[model samples]
Target: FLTAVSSIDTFLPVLNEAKLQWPTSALAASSEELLGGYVGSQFYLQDGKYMQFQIAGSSNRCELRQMIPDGGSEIGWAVDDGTTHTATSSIVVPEQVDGVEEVTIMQIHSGEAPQLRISWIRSKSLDGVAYEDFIMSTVRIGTGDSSDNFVKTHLADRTAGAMSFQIDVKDSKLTITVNGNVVVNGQDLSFWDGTDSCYFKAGAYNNNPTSESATARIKFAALAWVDHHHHH
Candidate 1:
């Protein structure tokens, strides 16, 4: 059960004044210096900036979305089973800008009911260039149902610029593993082009574009810029 406290503003000052100040650990202090500064050392920081945090361990997939506020231009990615498609529907960053990143993951439980429909995408477009891609080493039986097709596609063009992508679909029930020690159960797949107007997009081939379906659960963990120095 949960209770709502609407008028807590009056008590905030008291709580803030009475809050205890604990000593910072060595690791905590170092993290603070590297991450900028800490209010109470309750969060992690990176490169003198606040680091975002997210964790999803459910049997369902997660999603992330980005949009251009001025217009309806949007992009999204997700993982799921047949009944529910959990994906990010809101754009985290605005379009027509450089230095932006988004990521998601999907984990398939072993020995569980052989469910299907696991998909991913890095960049997306609505009416223009909608590109989606992924990599797979081996897809087992019963996993490519209408809810979970194993074949994935990578979108690339030489007219774009230097770009790369990676995908790993394994027995473990985890999607979107970035720069980690996860088993290289898939391939070093990527989409690249020499043109400056390249973008990414993806979705499930079996699921309808207007409705939800049962598929492998996807988990999105991070979205950031890879090359901060590069500019358009």
Candidate 2:
């Protein structure tokens, strides 16, 4: 709320300042925003310049969720009308604060039952002191908690820099590729079966214990769900 940008306008730089805008407020704005169906389970974030979701203060084991893109009242899902749904982005992971672990940079979380969460880990607390490392993680959890007790992943020990990411969800399969390499190609990703639900959410989710501060830098983001006759 301190970006000093304009208030609730469809312009860049100042667009994502307040009200969370219209494209991310409800699923009703998906088609107009290039998305096919209602993203009742998909979180929305518009393209912006000089954008940084700043997370400060205490009691932030949560996110600053504002809009739904289905119009605020209801949630939306990934515009899965057919073909393959993919989300691409380039980001620079921020340095981690002390005594804190599990700072999620991006997530594909659904609001439906039998929940499924695909989170990208940026910092894994090393001895509760220095955690300036990176890792691409994907786990089948009940409520995104127990998986924290024990570490799990397909790749490990990565350095921070300009990295490319892609989350492709198609035909009951969810793939997480980092830097053009397959890290976690999870199959039977039935998290989006039926009319169901799912949402897209990016930015820092500081699931860390009372730390100094949590911040993430996303250079640019893109989402494409082409309905080209359901090309499986």
Candidate 3:
């Protein structure tokens, strides 16, 4: 109904209860009727055939953000309820660059406290210790020091390639798995102060960019706020 640079072509949530009818041959999709997938008002992964977002070199900055249900309403996520939500994403590790900071891959955000945030720390030296590794952790945002990180851990280093991440968020606890291994088992995370409602989002966001590009060819396979948690 409007025009913009990154225009989205949305389809109706239509259904065919009886036997379906083909408007055109499946192979004749370029006739424009071919289905590309869906990203309706209740979905925001945009293009499912691999959404590629990168920071351009010339622009000296990079960020391609995709947050769900498509807007700034607290209509998504489980909030402070003791509900269970699991979201998994398949992504490629970002290419490292100077002046490029961390690449945020997943976030369970709220104004009160971050239910969770998982990110990749670019190659760097810490405390005079030269290093090449991946660091992951989270904090209780509203805490004044915020320095007393509720949960923080150092994970193993990994080379760029296909990486899988699974996040489980429950009312009083959370867990993170990387490539089929549990790396973060966290408690003290039910900081649901009831000040705000939270939502889930995943993508690549790099801070302090300069002639740098950060990327996350990410696909969030499943996401939901449910009373029961299931995984095989």
Using lDDT as the measure, the top candidate is 3
* Model 1, span 1-232: residue lDDT tens: 2111112232122111111112211122221222232332222222232121121222212221122222223322222211121111111111111221122322222223222223333354423546533322223333335524342323222112212233322222323322333333333211111112211211112212222222222211222212222323
Clash count (model 2, backbone only):
27
Clashes of 1: 44
Better of 1 and 3 by TM-score: 3
Q: Give the candidates in order of lDDT, highest first.
A: 3, 2, 1
As for lDDT, the candidate ahead, 1 or 3, is 3
lDDT of 1 at 66: 20
Q: Please identify model 3 stretches exceeding 4 Å from their true place.
A: 1-49, 56-79, 124-131, 193-196, 210-232
Clashing pairs in 3: none
**Models sorted by TM-score, best on top:** 3, 2, 1
lDDT of 2 by residue, 37-144 (tens): 112111223233323443433323222222333323334454243446555555555555554455555555556432233334445444344433555455453335
CA shift of 203, model 1, Å: 9.1
| lDDT of candidate 3 over 1-232, digit per residue (tens) | 2121113332211100001111111111121121233222212333333333333222221222122222222334554566666666656564555665665556676655556667667565543565464746564534565455555454546446656777777665677788899988755565564534565545444545554443222233322222254322
Q: TM per model?
A: 0.21, 0.57, 0.59
Query: Where is model 2 more than 4 Å wrong at Cα?
Result: 1-50, 57-75, 78-83, 112-132, 141-151, 154-158, 210-232
lDDT of 2 at 12: 28
